[PDB]
From Swiss-Prot:
This is Albumin. Ca(2+) 2 binds at D9, D251, D255. Its main location: secreted. Belongs to the ALB/AFP/VDB family.
Amino acid sequence: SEVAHRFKDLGEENFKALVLIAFAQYLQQCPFEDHVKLVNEVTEFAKTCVADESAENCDKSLHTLFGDKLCTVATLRETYGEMADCCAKQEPERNECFLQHKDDNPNLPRLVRPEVDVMCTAFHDNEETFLKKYLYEIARRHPYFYAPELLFFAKRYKAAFTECCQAADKAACLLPKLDELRDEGKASSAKQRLKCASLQKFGERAFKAWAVARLSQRFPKAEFAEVSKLVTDLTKVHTECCHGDLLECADDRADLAKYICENQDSISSKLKECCEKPLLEKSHCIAEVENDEMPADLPSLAADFVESKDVCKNYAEAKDVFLGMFLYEYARRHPDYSVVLLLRLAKTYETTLEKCCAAADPHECYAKVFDEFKPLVEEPQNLIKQNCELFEQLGEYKFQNALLVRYTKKVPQVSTPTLVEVSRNLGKVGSKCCKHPEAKRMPCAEDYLSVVLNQLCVLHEKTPVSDRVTKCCTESLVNRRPCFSALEVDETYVPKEFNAETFTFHADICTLSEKERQIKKQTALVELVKHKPKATKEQLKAVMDDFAAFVEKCCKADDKETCFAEEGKKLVAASQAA
Ligand SMILES: CCCCC1C(=O)N(c2ccccc2)N(c2ccccc2)C1=O
């Protein structure tokens, strides 16, 4: 039995959780109650398998068990139409069908949070149904969310209430801690969506290369043979979590933490504090540990990679191991380089040996390879340096609006809601990275953009409208950012045409938070730039300055939300003028 295997390792608690997460990630539209029922019916079965390892279908693979269970409610097309098809399938891929149907943008209603007085009560009354709901809402809204880590967010989510409800001012103690978690959860989720996308669309060799470079950065003193071992396991873990095998992912992940702590001295000296605490915390600790100090006397790369005479020979024997070594050797002594820049140089190195080794004289051909690295390294540095100066000037908000206009001009087809989200996140890079020394600015900024741009790619892949986004997204993982910065403005885009609904103005906007108020303005700018791509300089501002006047006036005007209509039609006249 397999279901028995995972049960003994994870135990009732985590086992019940992980399966809830899995069920939620598959049927995101299914109600909380039904999931709970299935989870139990499923957990009860497991209990019998432990004793009798052959009872009913205890000999089954999780895929068959889980699949059939869900298919007892999926067949209801009136609720989950396209789903029933999945259930009529067989073993080889009745699952590939499900995975294929995960929604990265579920049409699930917003998740508002009741007063601090109810949450605490509901928390204290029933502590298990409260937390179960949490995971349910997060896993169903983040189908790729790193499960093992979602159990970590749960432990803190609980600790938040456990303490705050016992305060003098619960609303003061909770709120903050809850906001902080709302953000970190999103960050951790996107960061992970990039991992599942890599593996799934580019293959595991691409994921491995990324890992090798990142680990070689964190663990400089770690030997290549050791890192490889870590990369091999690591891949496997994530390969599983992404395919939907949460249980084994959660299991294997623990094993890896166990290992990394056992062989602490061979990997990094910054793992201490991490290995002296609870599993879940220990795991989330290692995965976020700072780079170890750089080894003292380190030879020069050129020695074994451009000057040696056996380069090509070695490359032919086992290129994959050779290029892997190069990356490792270049990453370890360069924690000031983003991971995508390292994978670029590496790719430039390979392409070079390829054409060079089939020449009349290699050493002469590949002798000036480093000469080509300069341009690649410079580029990010400049972009970052420039985009940080601007950010400082304008501040976050103003900087976001800059990126809004710019990107909408690049890819006007893209949906307003998506451009608004991406551009805002893109703006977050300033407050996040610009306050860092050049030595840590590149890794922070560029690698972050890789996550933000991946969001744009997956979202866009649902309904492809811009072939330009498509190419930059599919052509090369490592080059996505330079690919986008290259794009200027679409010269084939035909400006949209105005219509009342191009934007509705109902007063309901005077109640929304300050945030959703900015958002509404930005969503406007996007719609403006879509209508008038070309004619655009300062007239946009002049217009956006007017848009603000409109809201303030009719939100403050005692008269019903009407002046927003009269003066709203008045402002439209002025707007068109510019
Ligand atoms: C929220 C996503 C986390 C991804 C991640 C992971 O699961 N492991 C990880 C897995 C188990 C225990 C500790 C960390 N490490 C990791 C980092 C460097 C070297 C090896 C592993 C990670 O960065």
